[PDB]
Amino acid sequence: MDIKINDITLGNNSPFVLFGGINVLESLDSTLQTCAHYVEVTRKLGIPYIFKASFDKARSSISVGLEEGLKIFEKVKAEFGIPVITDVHEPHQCQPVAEVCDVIQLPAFLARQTDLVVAMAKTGNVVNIKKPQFLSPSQMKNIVEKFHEAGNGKLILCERGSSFGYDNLVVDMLGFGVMKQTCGNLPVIFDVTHSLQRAQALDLALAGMATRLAGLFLESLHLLEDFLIRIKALDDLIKSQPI
Amino acid sequence: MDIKINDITLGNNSPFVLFGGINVLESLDSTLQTCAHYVEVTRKLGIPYIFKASFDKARSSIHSYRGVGLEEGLKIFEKVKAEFGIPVITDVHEPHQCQPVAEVCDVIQLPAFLARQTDLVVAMAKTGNVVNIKKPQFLSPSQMKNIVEKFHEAGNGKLILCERGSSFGYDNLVVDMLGFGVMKQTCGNLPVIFDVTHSLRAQALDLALAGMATRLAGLFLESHLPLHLLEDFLIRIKALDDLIKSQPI
Amino acid sequence: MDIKINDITLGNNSPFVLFGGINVLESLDSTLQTCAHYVEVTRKLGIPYIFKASFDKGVGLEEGLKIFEKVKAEFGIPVITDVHEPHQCQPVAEVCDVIQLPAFLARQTDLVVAMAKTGNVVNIKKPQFLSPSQMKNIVEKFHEAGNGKLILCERGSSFGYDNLVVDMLGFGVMKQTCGNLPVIFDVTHSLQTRRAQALDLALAGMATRLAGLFLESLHLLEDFLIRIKALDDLIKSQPI
Amino acid sequence: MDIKINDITLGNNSPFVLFGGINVLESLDSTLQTCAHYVEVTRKLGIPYIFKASFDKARSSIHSYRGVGLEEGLKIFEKVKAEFGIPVITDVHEPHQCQPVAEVCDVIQLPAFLARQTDLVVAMAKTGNVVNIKKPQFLSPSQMKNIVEKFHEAGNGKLILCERGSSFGYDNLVVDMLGFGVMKQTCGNLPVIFDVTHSLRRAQALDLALAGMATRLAGLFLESHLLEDFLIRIKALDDLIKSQPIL
Ligand SMILES: [Cl-]
Ligand SMILES: [Cl-]
Ligand SMILES: [Cl-]
Ligand SMILES: [Cl-]
Ligand code: NA
Ligand code: NA
Numbered sequence A: 001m002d003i004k005i006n007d008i009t010l011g012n013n014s015p016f017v018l019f020g021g022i023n024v025l026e027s028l029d030s031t032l033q034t035c036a037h038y039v040e041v042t043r044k045l046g047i048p049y050i051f052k053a054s055f056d057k058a059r060s061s062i063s064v065g066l067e068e069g070l071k072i073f074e075k076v077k078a079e080f081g082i083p084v085i086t087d088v089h090e091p092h093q094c095q096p097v098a099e100v101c102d103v104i105q106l107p108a109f110l111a112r113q114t115d116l117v118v119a120m121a122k123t124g125n126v127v128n129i130k131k132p133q134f135l136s137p138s139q140m141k142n143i144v145e146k147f148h149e150a151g152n153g154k155l156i157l158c159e160r161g162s163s164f165g166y167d168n169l170v171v172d173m174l175g176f177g178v179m180k181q182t183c184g185n186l187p188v189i190f191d192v193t194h195s196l197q198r199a200q201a202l203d204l205a206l207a208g209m210a211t212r213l214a215g216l217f218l219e220s221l222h223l224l225e226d227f228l229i230r231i232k233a234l235d236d237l238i239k240s241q242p243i
Numbered sequence B: 001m002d003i004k005i006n007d008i009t010l011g012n013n014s015p016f017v018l019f020g021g022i023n024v025l026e027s028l029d030s031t032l033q034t035c036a037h038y039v040e041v042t043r044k045l046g047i048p049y050i051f052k053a054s055f056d057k058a059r060s061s062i063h064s065y066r067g068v069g070l071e072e073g074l075k076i077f078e079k080v081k082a083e084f085g086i087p088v089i090t091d092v093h094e095p096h097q098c099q100p101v102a103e104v105c106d107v108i109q110l111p112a113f114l115a116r117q118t119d120l121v122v123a124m125a126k127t128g129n130v131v132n133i134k135k136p137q138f139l140s141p142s143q144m145k146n147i148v149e150k151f152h153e154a155g156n157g158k159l160i161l162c163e164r165g166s167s168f169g170y171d172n173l174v175v176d177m178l179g180f181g182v183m184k185q186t187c188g189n190l191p192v193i194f195d196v197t198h199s200l201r202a203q204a205l206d207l208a209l210a211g212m213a214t215r216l217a218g219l220f221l222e223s224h225l226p227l228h229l230l231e232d233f234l235i236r237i238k239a240l241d242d243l244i245k246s247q248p249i
Numbered sequence C: 001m002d003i004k005i006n007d008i009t010l011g012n013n014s015p016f017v018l019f020g021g022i023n024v025l026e027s028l029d030s031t032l033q034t035c036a037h038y039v040e041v042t043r044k045l046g047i048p049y050i051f052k053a054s055f056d057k058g059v060g061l062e063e064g065l066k067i068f069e070k071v072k073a074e075f076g077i078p079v080i081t082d083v084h085e086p087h088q089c090q091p092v093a094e095v096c097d098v099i100q101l102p103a104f105l106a107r108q109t110d111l112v113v114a115m116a117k118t119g120n121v122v123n124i125k126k127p128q129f130l131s132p133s134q135m136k137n138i139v140e141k142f143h144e145a146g147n148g149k150l151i152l153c154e155r156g157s158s159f160g161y162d163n164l165v166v167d168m169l170g171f172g173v174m175k176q177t178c179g180n181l182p183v184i185f186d187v188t189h190s191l192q193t194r195r196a197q198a199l200d201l202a203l204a205g206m207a208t209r210l211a212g213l214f215l216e217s218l219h220l221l222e223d224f225l226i227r228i229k230a231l232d233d234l235i236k237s238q239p240i
Numbered sequence D: 001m002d003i004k005i006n007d008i009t010l011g012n013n014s015p016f017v018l019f020g021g022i023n024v025l026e027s028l029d030s031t032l033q034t035c036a037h038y039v040e041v042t043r044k045l046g047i048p049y050i051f052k053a054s055f056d057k058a059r060s061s062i063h064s065y066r067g068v069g070l071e072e073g074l075k076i077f078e079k080v081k082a083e084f085g086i087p088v089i090t091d092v093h094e095p096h097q098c099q100p101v102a103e104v105c106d107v108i109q110l111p112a113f114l115a116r117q118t119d120l121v122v123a124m125a126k127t128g129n130v131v132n133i134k135k136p137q138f139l140s141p142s143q144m145k146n147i148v149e150k151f152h153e154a155g156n157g158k159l160i161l162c163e164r165g166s167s168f169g170y171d172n173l174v175v176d177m178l179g180f181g182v183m184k185q186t187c188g189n190l191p192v193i194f195d196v197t198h199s200l201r202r203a204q205a206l207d208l209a210l211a212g213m214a215t216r217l218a219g220l221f222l223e224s225h226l227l228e229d230f231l232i233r234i235k236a237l238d239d240l241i242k243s244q245p246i247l
Helices: A028-045 A066-080 A091-100 A114-123 A137-149 A175-182 A200-209 A223-240 B028-045 B070-084 B095-104 B118-125 B141-153 B177-186 B202-212 B227-245 C028-045 C060-075 C086-095 C109-117 C132-144 C168-177 C195-206 C220-237 D028-045 D070-084 D095-104 D118-126 D141-153 D177-186 D202-213 D226-243
Strands: A003-005 A008-010 A017-024 A049-054 A084-087 A103-106 A126-130 A155-159 A188-191 A215-217 B003-005 B008-010 B017-024 B049-054 B088-091 B107-110 B130-134 B159-163 B192-195 B218-222 C003-005 C008-010 C017-024 C049-054 C079-082 C098-101 C121-125 C150-154 C183-186 C212-214 D003-005 D008-010 D017-024 D049-054 D088-091 D107-110 D130-134 D159-163 D166-168 D172-174 D192-195 D219-221
Touching: A017 A028, A028 A049, A028 A066, A028 A223, A049 A066, A066 A084, A066 A091, A091 A103, A091 A114, A103 A114, A114 A137, A126 A137, A137 A155, A137 A175, A155 A175, A175 A188, A175 D202, A188 A200, A200 A215, A200 A223, A200 D177, A200 D202, A223 D226, B017 B028, B028 B049, B028 B070, B028 B227, B049 B070, B070 B088, B070 B095, B095 B107, B095 B118, B107 B118, B118 B141, B130 B141, B141 B159, B141 B177, B159 B177, B177 B192, B177 B202, B177 C195, B192 B202, B202 B218, B202 B227, B202 C168, B202 C195, B227 C220, C017 C028, C028 C049, C028 C060, C028 C220, C049 C060, C060 C079, C060 C086, C086 C098, C086 C109, C098 C109, C109 C132, C121 C132, C132 C150, C132 C168, C150 C168, C168 C183, C168 C195, C183 C195, C195 C212, C195 C220, D017 D028, D028 D049, D028 D070, D028 D226, D049 D070, D070 D088, D070 D095, D095 D107, D095 D118, D107 D118, D118 D141, D130 D141, D141 D159, D141 D177, D159 D177, D177 D192, D177 D202, D192 D202, D202 D219, D202 D226
Parallel strands: A017 A049, A017 A215, A049 A084, A084 A103, A103 A126, A126 A155, A155 A188, A188 A215, B017 B049, B017 B218, B049 B088, B088 B107, B107 B130, B130 B159, B159 B192, B192 B218, C017 C049, C017 C212, C049 C079, C079 C098, C098 C121, C121 C150, C150 C183, C183 C212, D017 D049, D017 D219, D049 D088, D088 D107, D107 D130, D130 D159, D159 D192, D192 D219
Antiparallel strands: A003 A008, B003 B008, C003 C008, D003 D008, D166 D172
């Protein structure tokens, strides 16, 4: 199943879409500068692009938030004409965030919170569902089920690694196919950035994209360019072969 | 460090406290009947007892009943306290809930999945209430100190640390019995309690006895084990706890 | 199921047996020194005791087996050692009451068969990568090769990289699926990924009701065992 | 570091080499027939190929056939080499097997369960042959350097590291795609190959094999027109990856 995000087509048999941006919105000018760089690189390589940012470091020490965050996203969308993606944490956030942000993201540790699931679904926006670090990939079916029961089928599934002992993550490359097979071939994307815990990012990205995926998260010599050239070469090859 | 909870002393070298009750508040009379059975059995055996329930929580389907909700839940907690004279514990998900819940409930509980969330931590801290911190299944025991430090910074030192197992492959939990000691040593010997119900019956008994062997402040369980085998179960736990606690560290 | 080892009754509802000794036999005099201490401590505590040692990581099988014979003569206790080769099993088992399948060799069917054939009691070291519900597959093999006198020895489970964790639920899974054969707990291996830690882990494991405790390890052993004995005595006095 | 295995160049920046064949040797006829299929497919695609089989090993039942044994097994290997002109690989379990096996078999393989058995390591090293070290599922990739050091101390540096997956809770194996790089960085860029079969459906094996090979590896190891379609896909990805300069 493909999802149309403005003029972008996202699907497991389409050319991969890059999701990327900043960890957390600090200011308008630093956001616009970061987004400009991604746009420039993706444009010249011909890779579709969706800008990503959080308005919150929710876990940091006692060390811009919603209304100002949305203002910045509005400007990003005006200047560059691309879609954006952000995370939501509470039901009450969903409708106002969804008014501006094309894709809204369910954090992996909140995936069981059915009140947030309902509030997200109700917006009718495209939703990115991050897989919990503890969950079998065949269990993503059950979260997909909830969204469908809540009346939203515009769903993206997002790998971010699995718990591996204490304080470590491994990515099970078999999980991609399991999610595609059990969840009706919804777009599957790979959060490489959060899976890592640094040519390691490139190895990981390439291994994941070798399984035939809709897209990838990457965080930004011209390292981003160098990575994307290689990922695009691999993606183009894989997508040119019959499934 | 011990924590006083009304007349109860909670401490890693005190007689274990039972935190027990039900999953979600659904009905007043049913709550009172279940609580009555806990109270009756714990009184019979001389075990300190704190009644547990959730007023609002996610279930396995989007429309399964989440509980009576905050306003009716606190009314039910009030009736439990008035009838039985015992402390109660409940969880919260959002900062706005922290004050109204803390006014009524003796212990407030930070769900394991929210335990790294700063805004909720600060809001819970500022109630001044005793707080039960559930250890996320994806967190190492030496990292509990980071959560404790946030609470300390925000002015609240009355903290309990609650084990509920660690992710082990897919869809599975193991409880590291060494984690208890790591939490004691790294978090200033705050009370450590063991949620055997969510760490998973012959099983619950084995796992409870193993955990309590390491010398813990308390045991945390839900029933709907089977309610009637509670006395059998608690007899064995109290036996072990009394033996362990009666020997010097 | 209980197993008789000479005068000892080994079983999940009998008083726990200690397996303990030295890593590798280096000399006769040394062996007798370490063993005498274990015997002296355990005798006064009333804890049945089986002396454990390897004959090669040191002195080799020829010298090793003479040493073991001397231990048995002097002290009158059973002994336990690992075997690595099918040919070794018969000669070793003439002397050593219990013979041990190393964890790394657990899938080596020709050793299993050669061990079974001796009719000796066998200690099966559970690999850290084997689940407790798969131990029944090793037990199957020994049963088909005609030997049912098996002890299952827990050593911890792989937990991410390097680290080990002991699943306290695995003890019960092994009892239920392997016909309640004696289960013992190698607390030491489980740790080498310390005094206070070994005590907590040993107490926790023995709280699940086990046949024995297995150590790869001013009066630390005696004081450790007092505590373990107290727990065990309590647990074993409770109806199952 | 590359390794020359007759006319084959094995290394992390060379075209991938296929290792595969049969589980245990039974007869000359049976062996030649399976090996012929591998040879035909790999020759048709221009993929270097090393035939694999065991002469003697444990099975999943105590009375399953362990294989034809050392003497007849080596006779069969000799004939595979003469008939097809390819290198072969087999595992050894005992120091005393190492010399005669190494007389015939181009690569000798250290089973994962024996990875830390010093006396076998030494005996394997002393043959001077190319050695394949199977990485235990309970050993981390940074632990492989210790095995490598043993071999080096015993005088043999012609070593391949073979990934097989890692223990992941109960029963499951996961392959850490990051472990390949760790092994290359810590072990002097010795050839690393991927045993995709133990690591575990054709669909599944394909995904996993492609993922591993995307990290840039010396070879692919199978414990076993289907093989053709599979290899066509692996070669496509390998050729692409290998054709680009290392970043
Ligand atoms: Cl709870
Ligand atoms: Cl959790
Ligand atoms: Cl041992
Ligand atoms: Cl292995
Ligand atoms: Na030669
Ligand atoms: Na040679």
